[PDB]
């Protein structure tokens, strides 16, 4: 499979450790900007779509509005205190709702919220 001019389109990766250093320094810069805050936002537990991966779960995009309302977190405050919100996802069942609500109250139990001024 070398029918085309592959010489002009070879990508080497001699900058792999340098890019790893760059990524770690970017994370350090994020830490410097957000000093007591975590560098990541909280994300829900979701089930993998297909039948092949139905058994396992992973991290989602953001919490459903029903999950936030059931956990006692208002919708507008949630992105400002480190929680990700996804308006597209639906719960569709009482078992993902309970799991992500438990995740949200676990996050609330370990949060140090500071006053505005």
């Amino acid at each position: 499979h070398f029918r085309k001019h592959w010489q002009r389109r070879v990508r080497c990766h001699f900058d792999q450790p340098g890019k790893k250093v760059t990524r770690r320094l970017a994370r350090r810069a994020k830490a410097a900007a957000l000093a007591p805050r975590p560098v990541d936002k909280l994300r829900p537990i979701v089930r993998c779509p297909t039948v092949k991966y139905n058994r396992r779960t992973r991290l989602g995009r953001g919490f459903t509005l029903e999950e936030l309302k059931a956990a006692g977190i208002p919708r507008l405050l949630a992105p400002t205190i480190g929680i990700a919100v996804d308006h597209r996802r639906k719960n569709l069942s009482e078992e993902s709702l309970a799991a992500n609500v438990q995740r949200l109250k676990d996050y609330k139990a370990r949060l140090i919220l500071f006053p505005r001024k």
Partner: protein
């Protein structure tokens, strides 16, 4: 290449760029994290020494030892074990250890002032004129078209009177 050959033979100076990065790599200021941040330690070790969580996501590689930073039912209701239609909107009602953690709790728990919002002179004059004609009948004050041009409800006027201290 021709430009670089030109500058090599030119007497014009080589303009050396300082290594000014767009983003600072260390926190700064007079806050708690800045005075306890070790510049020779990584993010994970610093957040371990603080007693805080650095990454809320799933672990993506192996960590060093001691990381500590890379984290009846009558109606069948799954949520009734989760309990402890309007909620407070602008804040939460949340109810040995490292020193930075204790300092953060202390500075987050310290009492603050409120800066209670007062009332304008014209609003106080309006509420005063409203009291001088009816006294306490808030229903009559709401009915009054002359002294209450914006036809406000008696509950709103009672709340404004209570805030003014005019009962």
């Amino acid at each position: 290449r021709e430009l670089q050959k030109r500058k090599r033979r030119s007497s014009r100076p080589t303009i050396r760029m300082p290594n000014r990065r767009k983003k600072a790599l260390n926190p700064a200021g007079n806050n708690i994290i800045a005075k306890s941040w070790n510049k020779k330690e990584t993010l994970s070790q610093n957040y371990t020494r603080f007693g805080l969580v650095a990454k809320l996501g799933k672990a993506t590689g192996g960590t060093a030892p001691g990381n500590k930073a890379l984290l009846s039912e009558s109606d069948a209701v799954p949520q009734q074990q989760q309990q402890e239609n309007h909620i407070r909107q602008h804040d939460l009602e949340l109810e040995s250890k490292p020193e930075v953690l204790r300092a953060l709790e202390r500075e987050a728990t310290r009492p603050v002032e409120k800066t209670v919002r007062h009332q304008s002179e014209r609003e106080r004059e309006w509420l005063q004129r409203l009291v001088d004609k009816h006294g306490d009948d808030v229903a009559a004050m709401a009915r009054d078209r002359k002294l209450n041009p914006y036809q406000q409800t008696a509950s709103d006027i009672k709340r404004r009177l209570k805030k003014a201290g005019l009962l």
